[PDB]
Design a binder for this molecule. Sequence first.
Ligand SMILES: CC(C)(COP(=O)(O)OP(=O)(O)OC[C@H]1O[C@@H](n2cnc3c(N)ncnc32)[C@H](O)[C@@H]1OP(=O)(O)O)[C@@H](O)C(=O)NCCC(=O)NCCS
Length: 268
Amino acid sequence: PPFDLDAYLARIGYTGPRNASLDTLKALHFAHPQAIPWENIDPFLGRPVRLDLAALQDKIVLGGRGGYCFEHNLLFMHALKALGFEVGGLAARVLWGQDAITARSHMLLRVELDGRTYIADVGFGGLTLTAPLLLEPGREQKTPHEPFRIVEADDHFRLQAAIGGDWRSLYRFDLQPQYEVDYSVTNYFLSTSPTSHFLSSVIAARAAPDRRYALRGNRLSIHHLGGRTEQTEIATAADLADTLQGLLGIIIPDRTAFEAKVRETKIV
Ligand SMILES: CC(C)(COP(=O)(O)OP(=O)(O)OC[C@H]1O[C@@H](n2cnc3c(N)ncnc32)[C@H](O)[C@@H]1OP(=O)(O)O)[C@@H](O)C(=O)NCCC(=O)NCCS
């Protein structure tokens, strides 16, 4: 069974030209993270996260749900390939909120356009990129949201975002290619290891034209573009599920089990 490009583009609301241009890459990179939320509902509920194409597009595209980094960026890669882009998988060690050396727990993409290398990443979370970036060290690059830059550190690169007047590192990466089987090993760990916090907390995000929504446990943050950050404490399991399903457009397959676990584990 092939990748259903029509259904994917309908899922993200893209009605533009279908080609392998930079303009198209920019339009898809803006739309995807607004249409499809970042979330860990399945890992939280102990449900398997499948990365194979058939399962991935059933869940996110037909089923209208979201996912976390591997789900987002594998999906995006499938779309970019179907549109004719030259795209490869990469991996990264997360620096945001992180001991000395962290695992390669994140996925991003490289896209080759007329001999130039871009990175793309629609799956990081709170600070998911809303434009592709030129792999050009040192340079501040504007996006439809925050400014980003890539800095060169020995062998590797760090992707940084400008937050509260500081350059903050999201993650570090090299150009080693990665394939689906590599991501499946890391995904198994993140989604099922008792140590992994993707299993024990509720975490979510979604981009919007003039803001980002981000949620960690019982704290909702609305980051207005070039503006204030509104923060809300969420008092109950019920209001947590309301916020996810209403405001963030996130699907909770079993709300009772969800609320039950939230109450059990003292998240609120
Ligand atoms: C879970 C997550 C979405 C929560 O984001 P959040 O709600 O903004 O909360 P965080 O605690 O992460 O943010 C840290 C601080 O930076 C600030 N911040 C985060 N995003 C911001 C933005 N877009 N603009 C301004 N400030 C921001 C927060 O307000 C917070 O401020 P504080 O220091 O006053 O508390 C985010 O931590 C995340 O995306 N984590 C990475 C997930 C990951 O590992 N992905 C790859 C593997 S799948």
